[PDB]
Design a protein around this ligand. Structure first.
Ligand SMILES: CC[C@H](C)CN(C[C@@H](O)[C@H](Cc1ccccc1)NC(=O)[C@@H](O)C(C)C)S(=O)(=O)c1ccc2ncsc2c1
Lengths: 99, 99
């Protein structure tokens, strides 16, 4: 689809059978989701945003369906203000910026 | 133009006599620029991202040139590591997300 930007680009995602709202975020390298349980091994990581650094858990090769488009990749889980879909998964679903 | 997201969507912006690189950021409600001493009235504001909040100065009706597209609007100035072009200006230059 085409998404305009007068409102936040919030979309429904499906992960682990669960539906969540997430923000299509071209200013994020990486996808970061709010606290949740995912299976498998994770690696502790730190990431730094506009307000400082947080600790997250890195899960690799996680299937997510974003607005009906399948992705399989890395998801960071931690105290992000909002679920954000970053470029690692935006590239997978063929998302581009256009003007 | 079409901008793929294999790399950070950095473009050149112009604000007065300053040329800077900025992210076309669909995850950003507002435009946030690194520290600079713009003329005219401003108001203090707090904005939150990953890691918490920072204090910014809100300037209204500031002209900004983004890839030779004219914009004018609110710009928040503060201690960000990266210049961020938010949705308030992204819509003025006709920017959409597409997949
Ligand atoms: C809420 C979702 C999101 C976390 C908001 N942020 C935009 C997001 O694209 C920011 C943009 C950014 C990039 C580099 C350095 C700092 C910030 N990205 C990120 O926070 C993550 O990718 C970090 C790992 C950097 S932001 O913190 O930069 C931001 C940007 C604009 C804005 N306007 C009103 S509140 C507000 C917050």
């Amino acid at each position: 689809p085409q998404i305009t930007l007068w409102k936040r680009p919030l979309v429904t995602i499906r992960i682990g059978g669960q539906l969540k709202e997430a923000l299509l975020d071209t200013g994020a390298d990486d996808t970061v989701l709010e606290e949740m349980n995912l299976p498998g091994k994770w690696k502790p990581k730190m990431i730094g945003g506009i307000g400082g650094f947080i600790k997250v858990r890195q899960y690799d090769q996680i299937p997510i369906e974003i607005c009906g488009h399948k992705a399989i990749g890395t998801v960071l889980v931690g105290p992000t203000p909002v679920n954000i879909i970053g470029r690692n998964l935006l590239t997978q679903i063929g998302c581009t910026l256009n003007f």
